[PDB]
Amino acid sequence: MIIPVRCFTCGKIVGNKWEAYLGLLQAEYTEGDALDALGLKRYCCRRMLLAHVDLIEKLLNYAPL
Amino acid sequence: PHAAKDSSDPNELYVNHKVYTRHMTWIPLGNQADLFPEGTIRPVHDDIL
Amino acid sequence: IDSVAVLRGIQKVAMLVQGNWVVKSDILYPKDSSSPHSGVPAEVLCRGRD
Ligand SMILES: [Zn+2]
C-alpha cells in the first residue's frame, strides 16, 4: 500500500527516501545508480525500495474525497 | 483555491496531500519548554512520508 | 496507389517531424475520450502531445 518507514532486516530509515527515488526515476537515473546515490550500500534497502509497489495512489483514486 | 485548469499532478490540485513527519508539533508538558530549547525535540529526518 | 493521393491523405491525419510522419493528437484522443491514467480531458492530452 505505502512505503514502510523501517527496513525489515536492518532498520534503516527508508520511508523518507521514496519520493526522492521517484525523482531519480523522473530523472535519467537507472535503478542501480539511483539506489547507489541514495546511500543504500547493503542490498536489503535496495530490495526494499526496488521491490516496493506504490499502491497508495491507486487506492486514493477510489477514496471518497 | 488557485490551480491550473488541468492540474494533472496532485501537487498543484491539492495541498497537504502528503503528511510528512515535519507536521508533527511537540507540545511541552509542565516545564519541558524551559528545559528543552526550541528545535531540540523534533523528528529526526523531518522528511518521512 | 498513386503517391499524391497517399500524401494528401497523410497530410490530414499526420504531421512531419524530422522527415518522419507522426499521427495527430486529436486522432488518437477523440473529443469524448479522456486519459486512462488521470481522467483529464482529451484537449489537455492533445496540447501536451503537440
Ligand atoms: Zn535495509
Location of C-alpha cell 509542565: B30
Q: Are B49 and A13 an interchain contact pair (Cβ–Cβ within 8 Å)?
A: no
* Residue spans per domain, chain A: 1-65
CA angle A40, A41, A44 (to 5 degrees): 75
The total of other beta-carbon atoms located within 10 Å of residue A18's CB is 21
The DSSP H or E segment spanning C16 is strand C14-17
Q: Which CATH superfamily is A1-65 part of?
A: Homeodomain-like (1.10.10.60)
- Each residue of C35-49: b (16+ CB within 10 Å) or e? eeeeeebbebbbeee
Do the beta carbons of residue B46 and residue B22 sit within 8 Å? Answer: yes
The reply to whether A22 touches chain B by the CB within 8 Å rule is: no
Task: Mark out the alpha helices in chain A (DSSP H runs).
Answer: 18-26, 31-37, 43-50, 56-60
CA distance C37 to C29: 13
| Residue B25 identity (one-letter amino acid) | T
Do the beta carbons of residue B1 and residue B13 sit within 8 Å? Answer: no
The tally of CA atoms less than 13 A away on the side-chain side of residue C30 is: 2
Cell triple for residue A17? 527516501
Burial-class residue B9 by CB neighbours within 10 Å (0-12, 13-18, 19+).
Answer: exposed
Question: What distances in angstroms separate CA C16 from CA A44, C10, C12, C30, one per listed residue?
Answer: 49, 10, 11, 21
Dihedral of CA C36/C22/C50/C29: which sign?
Answer: negative
Contacts of C38 in chain B (CB under 8 A): 8
Do the beta carbons of residue A9 and residue B39 sit within 8 Å? Answer: no
- Each residue of A23-38: b (16+ CB within 10 Å) or e? ebeeeebeeeebbeeb
The coordinates were experimentally obtained by: cryo-EM
CA distance C18 to A1: 43
Give the distance (Å) from ligand 1 centre to CA of residue A9: 6
CA distance C43 to chain B (A): 10
Computed on alpha carbons and rounded to an integer, the radius of gyration of chain A in Å comes to: 13
**Resolution of the deposited coordinates, in angstroms?**
2.9
CA distance B21 to B7: 26
Dihedral of CA C2/C3/C9/C13: which sign?
Answer: positive
